[PDB]
Amino acid sequence: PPHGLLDRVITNVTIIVLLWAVVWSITGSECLPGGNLFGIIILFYCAIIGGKLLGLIKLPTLPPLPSLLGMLLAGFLIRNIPVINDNVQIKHKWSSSLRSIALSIILVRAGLGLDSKALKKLKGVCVRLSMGPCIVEACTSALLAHYLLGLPWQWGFILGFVLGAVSPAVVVPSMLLLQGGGYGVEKGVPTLLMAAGSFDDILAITGFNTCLGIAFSTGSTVFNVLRGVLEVVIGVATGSVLGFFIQYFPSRDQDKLVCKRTFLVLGLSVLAVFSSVHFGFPGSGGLCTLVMAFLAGMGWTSEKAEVEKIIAVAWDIFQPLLFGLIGAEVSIASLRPETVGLCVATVGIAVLIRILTTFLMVCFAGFNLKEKIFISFAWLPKATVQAAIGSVALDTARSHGEKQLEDYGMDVLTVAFLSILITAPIGSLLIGLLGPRLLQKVE
Amino acid sequence: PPHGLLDRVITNVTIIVLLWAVVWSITGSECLPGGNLFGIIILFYCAIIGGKLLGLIKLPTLPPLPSLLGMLLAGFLIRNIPVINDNVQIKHKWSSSLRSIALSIILVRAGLGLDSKALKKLKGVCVRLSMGPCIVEACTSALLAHYLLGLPWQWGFILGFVLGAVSPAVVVPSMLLLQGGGYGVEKGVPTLLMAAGSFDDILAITGFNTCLGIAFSTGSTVFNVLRGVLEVVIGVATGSVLGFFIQYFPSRDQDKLVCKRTFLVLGLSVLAVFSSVHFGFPGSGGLCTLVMAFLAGMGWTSEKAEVEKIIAVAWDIFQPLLFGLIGAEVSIASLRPETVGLCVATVGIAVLIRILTTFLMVCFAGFNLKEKIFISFAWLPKATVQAAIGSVALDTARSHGEKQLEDYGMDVLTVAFLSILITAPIGSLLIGLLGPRLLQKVE
Amino acid sequence: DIVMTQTTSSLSASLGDRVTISCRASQDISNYLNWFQQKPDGTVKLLICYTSRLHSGVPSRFSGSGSGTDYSLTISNLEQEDIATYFCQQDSKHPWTFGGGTKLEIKRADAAPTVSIFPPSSEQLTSGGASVVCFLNNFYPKDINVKWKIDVLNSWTDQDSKDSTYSMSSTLNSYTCEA
Amino acid sequence: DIVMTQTTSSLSASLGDRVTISCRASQDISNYLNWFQQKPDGTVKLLICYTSRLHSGVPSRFSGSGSGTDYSLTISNLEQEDIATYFCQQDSKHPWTFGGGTKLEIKRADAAPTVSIFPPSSEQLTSGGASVVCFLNNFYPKDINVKWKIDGSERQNGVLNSWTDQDSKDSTYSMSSTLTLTKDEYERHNSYTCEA
Amino acid sequence: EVQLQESGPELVKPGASVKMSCKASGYTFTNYFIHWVKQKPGQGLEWIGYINPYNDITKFNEKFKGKATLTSDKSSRTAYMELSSLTSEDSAVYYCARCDGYYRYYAMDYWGQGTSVTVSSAKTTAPSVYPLAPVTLGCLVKGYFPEPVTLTWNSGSLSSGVHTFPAVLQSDLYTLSSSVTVTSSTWPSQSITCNVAHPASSTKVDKKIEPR
Amino acid sequence: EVQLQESGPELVKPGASVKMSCKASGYTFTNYFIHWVKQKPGQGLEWIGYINPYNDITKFNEKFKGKATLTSDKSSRTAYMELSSLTSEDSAVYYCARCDGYYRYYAMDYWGQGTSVTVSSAKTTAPSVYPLAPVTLGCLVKGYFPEPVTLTWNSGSLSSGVHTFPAVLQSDLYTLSSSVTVTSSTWPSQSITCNVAHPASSTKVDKKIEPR
Ligand SMILES: CCCCCCCCCCCCCCCC(=O)OC[C@H](COP(=O)(O)O)OC(=O)CCCCCCCCCCCCCCC
Ligand SMILES: CCCCCCCCCCCCCCCC(=O)OC[C@H](COP(=O)(O)O)OC(=O)CCCCCCCCCCCCCCC
């Protein structure tokens, strides 16, 4: 009977073909070239295959390249090869929804994986790490843009803020892997990085929104600033109430305890994210999910392990979708060689300054030199916020009908895409490498 | 802390509300009154609640009423109460797809649960039980319709054939429950009833189609008859190849063996059903699913138990949907007292003759009197085919623009609905009652 | 398709007698000859479904007898609100077809039109138009003849509700109008 | 509302000189003053994007100089295929506004129209109409005037004029005038004269 | 009770499209068929087609296949008919009636109020009053596009002899004509005038009719 | 090579609606913007609006807001414009041009061929040809609706002096006016008769010119 590599490959290809055929039979034209579901399925498969292929290649001393690069390249190729792009189209609504769901899953994972005892003893450190680097990188990015790119100050700051938020989708999985091996959980480095990861897109989005309002002279800056404070407050409050709720009611006496708990956390996080977006407070959803998951994990001292295992499986399913869609958002039109050199220079210098500032922001936290270096190099990744708000400035400029503002929006979009491309894979690789070396393993 | 009944009810209501809220947040208007998803979710919940409520009530000696009655009544009320019906609308495509998926699930369950050794020793018995009763009940139903209802002979036979196919959705679950307790698996009664269950709609549908063609003088009868033989042949062939395939390739050496096997069987069955419907051979899908599942189970001598457990969970999820939709298909317009008395009389006499004929068809199979009686009373249920093809004759008559033929189609539809209502619950109850008594338990 | 024809397009009747509108099918109608009544103001109500099944709320005076292919509708006694146009419809076959309708004129003694002639107004001549008008009204029955002895726009009035008469208006140096 | 004004609607040019089309904007567009060319057959091609950035494939003779709010397009030398209508467009603001257009007429010696007379034919009257047409052809430049001396009197109603674009061979012009009048009006006159 | 209300009279130009609505109240909308009947003046009614407002299946008379498009809205309880490429023939009154599709003896049994559609080219025009004198007298309102002139006389002249003949259309110009009958002995001095009240042009013209 | 093809000339009645298409080949359709420009005769061009054939966001000039409805179909590779409630002033040529939305110096680099739209109510009519005599002579084609006339003379007649003035509206009666110049010595027996070939009415008329 068949066995070995041939059996595995035949089973996998049959499963892929069968999934597509089932979807086509149920739906019909929607799962044929030019259809939404066909595009989604093809993007999913291509992202998975690219991740695996990139993981396979390891010629030099360094470990294999991350699957993030494979997924991003798969999406990029699907978008920027005309023949494939014509037959692979995904509605914007579906892409946004899938990316939001992936964000919810990863935020739940991060919240469940935090350590309460460690998080208690590093409070100021987390605040500094979440605030300082973003603001300093935004300021220096605006300074660079005003000179290399010629942008005015308002647009320079729009660029800085849209280039100043790290992606939990890149940081959380790697730090969770490290925490699984106990590689740095003696001072709480994984907890510090996972906690601060989710509070960095409320300072970035708020700054970007207020600067955009100033640039287009629309509305008021006071309300735009206060929106961020309100987002923080309502996120914390909703997360607290929901976490204390699910922490108690699903009780040890119920039969399907694990299934009910996982459904509750996942559904509540997804509902929080989507409803917050709907009601005009985007960013309180992530904080609410983080707080709720953290409190629920505190409630289930050790019974949460199965919940996080199921969520990890869900994340393994959803990561290819997220990163393939992020890659598909970018087009070679933005990355044209007219001025791409200066955009790359600005992104590079901004990243260097961000690393330098992150090193300084953790100086007085009691960490050793190696931990400081690891934290500095584990805080660069930038994937999700940049893709979410990358083209908003250009769209607003287009709506207003101006032409110079369109040029500025084009520069902002180019910078965002370059930052994603040259920061997500390098950051993931650097975390994977420097984890075992610089962090003190525990038993 | 909370515990007991209050905790269970609060958790369940919160889960229900959370599911609806998550779907609404993701989708939007589609999960609000008058929306498709809102209707589907409300129908699902109402069917579940009705099933549980009906199961609760048991005043007399007989056990509690079946959940089928609760689900059917939930769908019926949702359809026939104007205020609820206005806000609860489900697209016909979605209803058809969900019913087909439920049929696929139950057919897979039946196929996996068959016994090869028993099925070998009762071959003629299965053929007789699948053929005789359907044809005799169709003939007697046509005879009754021609006199009580005044229908011509062609329409009488259309009625007989649309009233002559039992539902595996009602028979298979009960016989599987009996087989779980080993209540009749010494001569193979559960296998006999489950096997014959999925070959009774190829003859019924074929007879109905040919008689409809004769009545409307469309096409040719030869091709309509040959379609059934072709359906049988291609169903058997496709089932054989697919079953021998999945019986071997997913190997003992693979990690996620159970998950891959369950996905393979379910996806292949769903694909078979839907593709057969699409290509114009409706009915070969069910036979293909039955044969494929049977052969796969033969391949996995004892490792299939987990697969059927997962499929049983899926069926527990999907049964409320199937029966709620079936109930929602019927409207009080058909069940008007103009001539409902004669329709009820015809259905009743046809069912009595069906029982009498089923008793005779198993006379020479070696069964004892009690087994013969149980088989006779376990072969009446009629739920799925009747709802699928109940209104086809009326639709064809409407399309042709005739008026007398519309009257005949109305009579056919009334008979189909009455048969469903007064046969599915009685049949389920009778199986549940007579199982333990008439069947010889094994250890 | 089936063509329904009604012999009489204007059934003259009194206010207290029995009338019978007859509808004749074309090929064959089993009993599918619904009857409709349309009032002069334009409101149409269903009277009888399936040959004789009197509809709910319709007065018992409406007896829809007649079967086979010769169909009929009868009014036991007439009343002022029974004057309308009655249509016979068939739904036996696909394209539903209505009859030509029947108007229930009320009987009265014959009259003679006034046949007045109005030469175009002097203001009209200065305007540029030249339209002569003949006004002959308060006549009965509908049978009239228009002729000119000169040296066309024709409009009729509905049956007068008070005196059950009719009016004719016609439009076009010694101008004479005769009829 | 950045309405763009081109001072000259038709500038005469020889076949070997440097022409300069001037376009001015009613506002301050920085440099977004794309130039377009439309040929007589109706084909329009982009010429110069962003003031002076010559487009790909366009001959080097075109130079889009000019800045501020007063731009200009220049032809180093005039070719026979250069004869067309040139539009200046601005995309600085939301409503993209095009210029009035400029027509390049080839300069030549001044001519005089033939101004022939054509009284309505017998078919006109039998048909039920009466049309008088003047045929003055091969005149230069386009500076012409149309007038009528019907029985001495001048009527300014019922006149149809159709012009012919610059002649591609002799660079001349043609004027077509047609008058539709009542038959009775013609019946009272027999001598028809056309002057210009 | 059950009542169907449809849109009001509409004016269209030839080659244009018109969408008329029919809103039903007093019963379950989705449980009945909606049938459309066109009654051109002079001729009797004539079936157009129907739509099932439960699954939206439409059957059309082969004469109107293409000319009419039937749609329905469950939420609004209204059914729409879309008429395309309107011509002179398409000008008539259109009815919507319901019909129980699952009753062995179904009929219409409930009709709308009518929806006059006029396909013409002219636009709003002010009516012209032409007083007429030699007993009787009328003002013979001349051409006007909009239909509802609502011609009326002063109170007192409406007692008798007020035959108001219907506005006959001709050359896309409705030509109403009225007359008033009064004894000759009562016409030495008349203070009677037909007050034309064309609302579309809002021209409340009187044009006092005088003896000639 | 990249080119855009639009629909042919179309004639519509006033108040109707017209759809015009623009099919783009030679490049990635969804990668550029589709801009619509209307050029009325005599006047200059007028920017109507644009459609982004990647996510379907349209920007409209305030003047043409409501009058135009822009849509696109990636599969069909075409962009459509809707012109509702046409008018005599909506009769003009319409262009579709692409523009690179993500280039800092974008413009409309490639244009369509034009789509003449005529909004009138007349109907196809046979042109009327009238021989003209006193040198030269003309035909003076009279009223006719469409412009496929393509007036021509016999072979060799068009050698010189064949000025064919453009067709003029003339109250929905288009009218050419041709001329032929020949010497007197060559006109004792003239075989030069203009052959009007209006194909819409297929009225191939000759109307031999006679030497009055
Ligand atoms: C608790 C309720 C759970 C019920 C199930 C939820 C829906 C999933 C079942 C899908 C069948 C109904 C919709 C099919 C699409 C349609 O009919 O209609 C097809 C429609 C387009 O036609 P419409 O005009 O009707 O919208 O396409 C869609 O809208 C896409 C819908 C997304 C889901 C399609 C893919 C479903 C694949 C599910 C595989 C199931 C495997 C077996 C599971 C055990
Ligand atoms: C392997 C691929 C799996 C990817 C996931 C499949 C799709 C399920 C995710 C839904 C999000 C995208 C579509 C949302 C509908 C939309 O955007 O668009 C909403 C559309 C209507 O708008 P459109 O015009 O775009 O079709 O509605 C629909 O078509 C209904 C689609 C059926 C599915 C809706 C319900 C999904 C609920 C899923 C809950 C997920 C919980 C978390 C899981 C871990």
Residue numbers in the entry:
A (entry chain B), B (entry chain A): 79 to 521
C (entry chain C): 1 to 151, 159 to 179, 190 to 196
D (entry chain E): 1 to 196
E (entry chain D), F (entry chain F): 1 to 134, 144 to 221
Question: Which statements did the authors publish about this structure?
Answer:
The sodium/proton exchanger NHA2, also known as SLC9B2, is important for insulin secretion, renal blood pressure regulation, and electrolyte retention. Na+/H+ exchangers are physiological homodimers, and structural studies have shown that each protomer is made up of a dimer (scaffold) domain and a core (ion translocation) domain. Na+/H+ exchangers operate by an “elevator” alternating access mechanism, wherein ions are transported by the core domain against the dimerization domain, which remains fixed due to oligomerization. The additional N-terminal helix (TM−1) in the dimer domain is domain-swapped, mediating homodimerization by interacting with TM8 and the TM7−TM8 loop from the neighboring protomer.
After sample preparation, data collection, processing, and refinement, cryo-EM maps of the human NHA2-Fab complex could be obtained to 2.8 Å resolution (FSC = 0.143 criterion) with map density extending to 2.4 Å for many of the TM helices. Human NHA2 retained the expected homodimer with a Fab bound to each protomer. The majority of the Fab interactions were found to be with residues located on the extracellular surface of NHA2. The cryo-EM structure of human NHA2 in nanodiscs is overall very similar to the compacted bison NHA2 structure in nanodiscs with an r.m.s.d. of ~1.2 Å following superimposition. Interestingly, despite the reconstitution of human NHA2 into nanodiscs with crude yeast PI lipids, we observed density for two phosphatidic acid (PA) lipids on the extracellular side of the high-quality cryo-EM maps. The negatively charged phosphate headgroup and the fatty acid ester linkages are coordinated by two highly conserved lysine residues, K169 and K171, which are located in the scaffold helix TM3. The phosphate headgroup further interacts with the indole nitrogen of the highly conserved tryptophan residue W172, which also forms stacking interactions with the glycerol PA backbone. As expected, the human NHA2 structure has a cavity open to the outside that is negatively charged. In human NHA2, we observe that R432 in TM11 forms a salt bridge to E215, which also forms a charged interaction to K460 located in the TM12a-12b breakpoint. Interestingly, the ion binding aspartate D278 has also formed a salt bridge with R432.
